[PDB]
Amino acid sequence: QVYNFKRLVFTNCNYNLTKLLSLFSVNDFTCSQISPAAIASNCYSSLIL
Amino acid sequence: PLKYSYINKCSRFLSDDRTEVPQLVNANQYSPCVSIVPSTVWEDGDYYR
Amino acid sequence: YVDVGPDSVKSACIEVDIQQTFFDKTWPRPIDVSKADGIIYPQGRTYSNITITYQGLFPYQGDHGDMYVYSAGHATGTTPQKLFVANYSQDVKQFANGFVVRIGAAANSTGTVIISPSTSATIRKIYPAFMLGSSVGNFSDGKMGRFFNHTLVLLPDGCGTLLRAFYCILEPRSGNHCPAGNSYTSFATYHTPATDCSDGNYNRNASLNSFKEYFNLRNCTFMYTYNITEDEILEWFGITQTAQGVHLFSSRYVDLYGGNMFQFATLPVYDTIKYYSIIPHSIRSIQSDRKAWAAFYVYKLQPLTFLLDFSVDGYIRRAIDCGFNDLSQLHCSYESFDVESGVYSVSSFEAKPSGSVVEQAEGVECDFSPLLSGTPPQVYNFKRLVFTNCNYNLTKLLSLFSVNDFTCSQISPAAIASNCYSSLILDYFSYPLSMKSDLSVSSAGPISQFNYKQSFSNPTCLILATVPHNLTTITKPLKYSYINKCSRFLSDDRTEVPQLVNANQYSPCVSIVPSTVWEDGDYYRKQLSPLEGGGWLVASGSTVAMTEQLQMGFGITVQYGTDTNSVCPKLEFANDTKIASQLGNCVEYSLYGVSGRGVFQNCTAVGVRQQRFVYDAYQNLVGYYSDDGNYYCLRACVSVPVSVIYDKETKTHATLFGSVACEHISSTMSQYSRSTRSMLKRRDSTYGPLQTPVGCVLGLVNSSLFVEDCKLPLGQSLCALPDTPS
Numbered sequence: 070q071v072y073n074f075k076r077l078v079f080t081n082c083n084y085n086l087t088k089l090l091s092l093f094s095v096n097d098f099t100c101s102q103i104s105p106a107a108i109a110s111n112c113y114s115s116l117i118l
Numbered sequence: 119p120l121k122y123s124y125i126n127k128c129s130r131f132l133s134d135d136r137t138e139v140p141q142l143v144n145a146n147q148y149s150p151c152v153s154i155v156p157s158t159v160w161e162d163g164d165y166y167r
Numbered sequence: 168y169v170d171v172g173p174d175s176v177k178s179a180c181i182e183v184d185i186q187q188t189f190f191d192k193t194w195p196r197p198i199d200v201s202k203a204d205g206i207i208y209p210q211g212r213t214y215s216n217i218t219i220t221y222q223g224l225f226p227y228q229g230d231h232g233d234m235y236v237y238s239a240g241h242a243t244g245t246t247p248q249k250l251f252v253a254n255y256s257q258d259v260k261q262f263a264n265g266f267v268v269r270i271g272a273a274a275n276s277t278g279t280v281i282i283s284p285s286t287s288a289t290i291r292k293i294y295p296a297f298m299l300g301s302s303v304g305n306f307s308d309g310k311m312g313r314f315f316n317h318t319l320v321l322l323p324d325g326c327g328t329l330l331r332a333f334y335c336i337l338e339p340r341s342g343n344h345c346p347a348g349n350s351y352t353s354f355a356t357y358h359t360p361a362t363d364c365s366d367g368n369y370n371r372n373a374s375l376n377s378f379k380e381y382f383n384l385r386n387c388t389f390m391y392t393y394n395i396t397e398d399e400i401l402e403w404f405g406i407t408q409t410a411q412g413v414h415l416f417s418s419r420y421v422d423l424y425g426g427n428m429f430q431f432a433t434l435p436v437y438d439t440i441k442y443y444s445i446i447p448h449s450i451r452s453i454q455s456d457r458k459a460w461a462a463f464y465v466y467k468l469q470p471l472t473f474l475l476d477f478s479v480d481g482y483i484r485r486a487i488d489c490g491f492n493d494l495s496q497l498h499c500s501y502e503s504f505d506v507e508s509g510v511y512s513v514s515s516f517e518a519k520p521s522g523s524v525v526e527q528a529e530g531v532e533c534d535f536s537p538l539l540s541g542t543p544p545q546v547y548n549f550k551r552l553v554f555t556n557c558n559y560n561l562t563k564l565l566s567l568f569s570v571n572d573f574t575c576s577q578i579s580p581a582a583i584a585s586n587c588y589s590s591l592i593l594d595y596f597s598y599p600l601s602m603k604s605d606l607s608v609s610s611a612g613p614i615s616q617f618n619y620k621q622s623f624s625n626p627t628c629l630i631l632a633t634v635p636h637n638l639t640t641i642t643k644p645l646k647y648s649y650i651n652k653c654s655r656f657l658s659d660d661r662t663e664v665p666q667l668v669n670a671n672q673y674s675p676c677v678s679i680v681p682s683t684v685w686e687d688g689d690y691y692r693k694q695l696s697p698l699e700g701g702g703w704l705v706a707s708g709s710t711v712a713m714t715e716q717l718q719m720g721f722g723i724t725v726q727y728g729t730d731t732n733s734v735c736p737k738l739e740f741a742n743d744t745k746i747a748s749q750l751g752n753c754v755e756y757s758l759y760g761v762s763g764r765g766v767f768q769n770c771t772a773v774g775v776r777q778q779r780f781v782y783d784a785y786q787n788l789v790g791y792y793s794d795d796g797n798y799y800c801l802r803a804c805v806s807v808p809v810s811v812i813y814d815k816e817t818k819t820h821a822t823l824f825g826s827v828a829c830e831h832i833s834s835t836m837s838q839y840s841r842s843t844r845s846m847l848k849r850r851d852s853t854y855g856p857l858q859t860p861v862g863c864v865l866g867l868v869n870s871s872l873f874v875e876d877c878k879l880p881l882g883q884s885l886c887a888l889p890d891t892p893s
Contacts, residue, residue, distance in 0.1 A: 070159075071124040072152050078411060078435055114211075115411055135582050136732075146410040147439060153302075 079116040123159040125151060131167075169387040171335070172372075175379035178342030183355045183447075184241070187254040189282050195231030196269065196464050200473070200491075203483045205267050205466055207405060207416055207428040216479040220502060224264055224407060224468035228488035228495075229843060232269070232464040237293050238282040239457035240357060240449035247359065247451040251282045255447040256353045257311040259303050262443040265468045267405035267416070267428065270294065273461035274399035280459045288459035292399050294323040294330075295463055296356065296374070296446035303442045307339070308351050312444055317388065319413070319436060322356075322446070325373035326364045328395045334436050335387035345381055354381050359451035374448075389435060395419075403428050407468070412437040425482045474499055492846045493811055494820060508815035510823075510879060510887075515806040516838040520764060521752035522744070526794060527759060529739050533557035535564050538595055540640040543719055545648045545684070547618040547668075547677050549596040558737040559591065568632035568719065571600055576608050578626035578725075587735035589728030594619070598720030599647040599711040603631055606720060613651040613709070615668075621722055622670040630721040647711040647718070648684035650676055658701030671724065676706035684708035748793065753804040758791060765803040767791070772798040807831070809840065812879055817890045821866040822847055823881070829856040829863035859885055 086109050100108060128151035129140045143149040154166045198204045205226040226232075240250035271292035280286040302315040320333040339346035346354060356377045358364075363373040403418035403426050413434040421429045445465075452458060476485035489499035493513040497506055533554040544550050561584040565573075573580045596619070598606070605612020606629055608621050621627040634641050653676035654665045668674040679691045690707035740747070751767040761780065770790065773781060781790040781800070790800030808825035824832060834852075836844055851866045859867070860883050872888065879887040 070119065070122070070157065072149055072155065073157070074148075076437065078437070117411070134585075136585075136587050 077118045079118070080114070084116070120158055125149065125155055125159075127165070169335075169390045171333070171384050171387050171390060174383045175376060177380065178340050178345060178348075180340065180342055180345040180348075180351075180381050181240075181355075181357065181377075182249040182344045182350075183353045184249050184251055185254050185353060186251040186282060189251075189284070190236050190238075190253040192234070192236065192281075192462070194234060194462055196234075196272065197231045198226050198228050198466065200228040200486050200488050203426065203476075203486050205269070205403065205428075206426075206473075206475075206483050206486055207267070208422075208483065210430065213481040214475075214477040215481070216477065218474060218476050218502070218504065220472060220499065221475050222470070222472045225471050225473060225488075226267060226466040227469055227471070227842075228491045229845070230466050232466045235295065235445060235463045235465070236281055237295070237448050237460050237463070238280065238450065239452050240282075242452060242454045242457070245453050245455075250355055250357060250449045252353070252355050252447045252449050254353070255445050256355065258444055259312050260443045262299065262440040263467055264470070265405060265407035266443075267403060267466050267468065268295070269401065269403060269464040269466070271399055271401045271461060272464060274401065276461075278459050278461075280457055283457060286457065286459070288457065290459040290461045292327070292402075293460040293463070294327045296323060296448055297321040298444050298446050299440045299442070301439055301441045303444075306351065307347060308349060310351065310353065312354070313346075314442070314444075317438065319434075319440070320378075320446075322374050322378065324375055325358070325370040327397055328369060329371050330393040330395055331375065332389070332391040332393075332434065333384075333387065334389035334434075336385045338383035338385040340381055340383060353447070355447040355449060356381075357449045357451050360456070361451070361453070391432070391434070393432070398423070400424070401426070405468070408437070408440055410437060413440075422482060425484070427482055472499070474502065474504065476504060490842060492841055492843050493809070493822075494813070494846055496841075497811075497813070506813065506815065508813055508879070510810055510812050510881070513809050513811055514840050515808050516836065516840045518753055518804050518806055519838045521749070521754040522746060524746055524749055524751070524754045524756045524767070525758070526747060527757075529558075529737075531556070531558045531737075533559035533591060533734065535559070535593070538564075538593075539567070539638060540642075542642045542644055543595055543597040543717070545618075545644065545682065546596045546598055546614060546720060547648075547650045547674055547680065548682060549594045549619055549673075549722065551592060551594050554591040554593075554734055555589065556733040557591075558735065560736055560738060560741075565630070565632070567638065568634060570630060570632045572603055572606070572629065572631035572720075574607075574630075575626065575628035575723075576621075576623070578628070580628060583626060583628055583723065583725060585736055586725070586727075587732045588725040589731040589733060590726045591734045592724045592726075594722035594724075596720055597644050597647055597717060598631060599714065599718045600631060600633070601711050602647070602649070606631065614649055617650045617653040617666075617668050617674050617676065619722060620668045620670045620672070621724060625724045625726055627725075628721075628723040630723070632719055632721070634717040634719065636716065641717055643713055643717040644683050646683065646713055648708055649710075650674060650680055650684075650706055651709045652676075652690065652705065652707040654705050655695065656703040656705055658695075663705075674706075676704060679704050680706050680708055684710050686710065748795070748799070761788070763788060763803065765801045767799045767801055769797055770800040807838075812881075812887050814879070814889050816892075819850075819890065820846070821864065821887070823859075823864045824862060826862040829858050832856045832863050832865075861885060 098105060128149050129138050131138050141150055207223065207225065209221060209223070235255060240252065241248035273290050274292040277289040280288045298314060298318055298320060300314040300318040304313050304315065306313045314337065317334060317336055322333065323330050341347040344350050344352060356374060358373055358377065363370040400423060405416040405428055407414045413436050414430055415432040415434070416428040417431040418426045418428045420431045472489045474487035475483050478484050485504060487495050487498045487504065489496055496513060497511055498504060534552060537552065575583055602614060605614040607615060608623070608627060653674050654663050656663050666675055679693045687710045688707065690705070693704040695702045695704060749767060750769065753764055753766055755764045756762060777792060779792050780788060783789050788801055790798065792798050807827045809822065811820055811822045813820050847865055854866065856863050856865055857867050857869065861881060867887070874886060874888060877886040877888050879889065881887055
């Protein structure tokens with residue numbers, strides 16, 4: 070529920086987010102302060118979902 | 119989910135029974151009100167204290 | 168969940184006896200910021216032999232910290248006994264952006280056994296245990312420190328060589344001296360050297376097992392473990408929390424000798440910590456073998472800024488807490504640990520606030536005087552007064568009667584008097600006390616049925632009271648009366664329909680019934696017009712004999728505004744300090760919503776009279792006409808300018824308070840510009856302030872010497888000689 074959120078902290082690991090995109094139909098994609106393409110290609114100290 | 123649910127209010131009554139303190143959720147934090155709200159809202163407009 | 172393993176079999180716990188007075192020791196340990204004490208090394212970057220400014224969470228320089236000491240429990244002869252521990256279990260603290268600790272500080276030295284100082288045993292490093300969480304409260308026995316939902320356990324196991332972290336839920340045990348059991352005193356854990364920490368097989372589960380005896384794990388989410396080796400050299404350890412989770416810092420992993428702290432580990436737990444406590448622990452050693460343990464310290468982190476002296480090896484060796492004192496501030500302003508000599512400007516004293524002063528219109532007064540004269544109405548004929556936008560004191564109003572019934576619905580009777588509402592409404596009528604059983608919004612009686620009703624859409628009240636012998640303007644009905652029937656006969660002259668009284672309304676039958684009922688059981692009828700559908704109004708009533716003092720009833724209802732609550736119990740400083748004026752200090756004020764801080768004084772008037780606010784050409788408020796008819800005027804407030812003398816060659820200093828004069832100067836400051844004055848006090852704790860032609864100074868010494876150039880001149884003929892060379 071909107072007040073019960075699950076969180077995943079990601080460190081030390083490799084990803085390919087388009088694999089995840091294939092799993093769902095996306096009806097809204099908006100990113101603030103970063104292009105969506107860049108956030109997919111950027112490397113980080115952490116990724117949080 | 120049995121129903122999708124959300125909290126549409128979160129505030130604390132002042133001990134003097136005349137005023138009330140609103141509690142907007144903090145960034146990256148659970149609202150304090152989660153401690154009383156059930157895992158789903160049983161009926162629309164339900165409230166808890 | 169996490170495979171923590173089976174819980175302890177027995178429900179019983181070793182009894183815990185609080186011996187906290189044995190732990191009373193004075194041994195504060197201030198942060199020597201110039202030695203980088205407690206300094207956490209910056210994240211992801213390093214530097215050469217250059218120095219920089221830096222902002223982050225650090226311990227305050229003058230913070231002497233909190234001290235904790237662990238000790239052996241009771242044991243006698245060659246066997247263990249009940250536990251003797253401090254009251255550490257009750258020490259719940261507000262978690263506040265992390266903290267750091269000092270451990271092994273007194274290692275490689277000697278002290279006392281503490282629980283049995285009558286030994287003077289040597290002391291060694293011992294590791295502390297802690298508990299963190301978002302909620303705390305009372306145990307079933309009313310004991311302090313109970314945590315709820317999920318908690319974080321920081322527990323060393325067996326020897327210091329093993330550290331385990333746990334995130335679980337704790338379940339109270341019902342055994343003897345156990346959290347749920349009613350013989351529970353205080354939670355504690357323990358270690359038994361006789362079998363624990365064996366040289367060829369250290370008991371890796373020792374601490375945890377004694378832990379399990381008091382709590383059962385119930386659903387665990389996290390568990391981590393760390394490999395540690397023993398070393399009596401002092402170590403630093405700290406904890407912080409961010410949106411990425413809890414972070415763990417230590418000097419041990421990287422900087423054994425310099426003490427710089429590095430992010431040793433991190434936790435997936437991001438649940439906000441609100442409370443922090445320390446877990447008590449005791450050693451089950453043989454009485455003759457009890458070993459004293461080194462004192463342990465804790466320091467709280469704060470969002471401060473520092474100069475950092477980095478070594479070419481990248482280690483922080485020295486640091487400057489900018490806000491500690493004026494000198495430190497200058498160092499930060501010059502980004503250097505060696506500022507050139509001279510006189511320098513420093514921030515002024517803020518002065519200080521006083522009790523507030525507020526003026527606003529008073530006396531509006533919610534009407535309530537009609538109740539005190541004439542004869543009150545029969546309960547079906549009750550009279551109503553509506554009040555909005557006005558000031559009241561119902562508890563004063565009710566002291567005019569003796570109250571024999573004070574009740575309400577959906578509001579406590581006390582709360583309705585103190586609560587503000589958009590409106591206040593009062594109904595009043597004569598009412599004998601003999602009928603009091605019939606007066607409730609829920610009553611089965613004829614009074615609720617036909618005479619008076621109150622809506623359940625608003626809080627309501629009912630009051631029965633009687634008239635004092637000193638309310639001679641109040642008069643009484645020949646008999647008390649009420650309607651005990653009200654119905655309309657249907658036009659077919661056989662069917663009949665009862666008319667229960669409408670909430671907050673007169674019964675329809677009041678139109679036929681007389682202002683009082685002349686006799687018990689009197690009844691009346693009225694033919695109804697064809698527009699009414701025909702039929703007959705029918706009503707009847709009953710009476711109660713008049714009494715020596717009038718007996719009365721009242722109804723009260725209120726409406727709470729969403730934002731329209733204009734009716735309030737305002738009092739004109741009743742039971743209050745009379746804040747309306749001061750002669751005066753630097754009081755914060757509000758004048759009909761105009762606000763600021765300043766000194767008011769009873770000065771002379773300038774016009775235009777009664778326009779209240781006098782202003783400057785820059786629109787600064789200048790003064791005020793009070794509604795007590797006196798002009799007062801406002802100087803706002805002033806600050807004390809400050810500067811300091813710095814003698815770099817001797818590395819000493821002295822100060823100047825500007826033009827303030829020593830009448831307003833004191834050994835410590837109540838205002839104040841900075842958290843300390845102690846650097847001045849290093850020599851000036853023994854001397855009074857001195858006046859000069861510029862103004863009052865500290866530590867300047869009147870030598871009355873004549874010198875051509877001091878290189879520190881204060882202007883005028885004033886001068887400031889350096890202390891003579893070594």
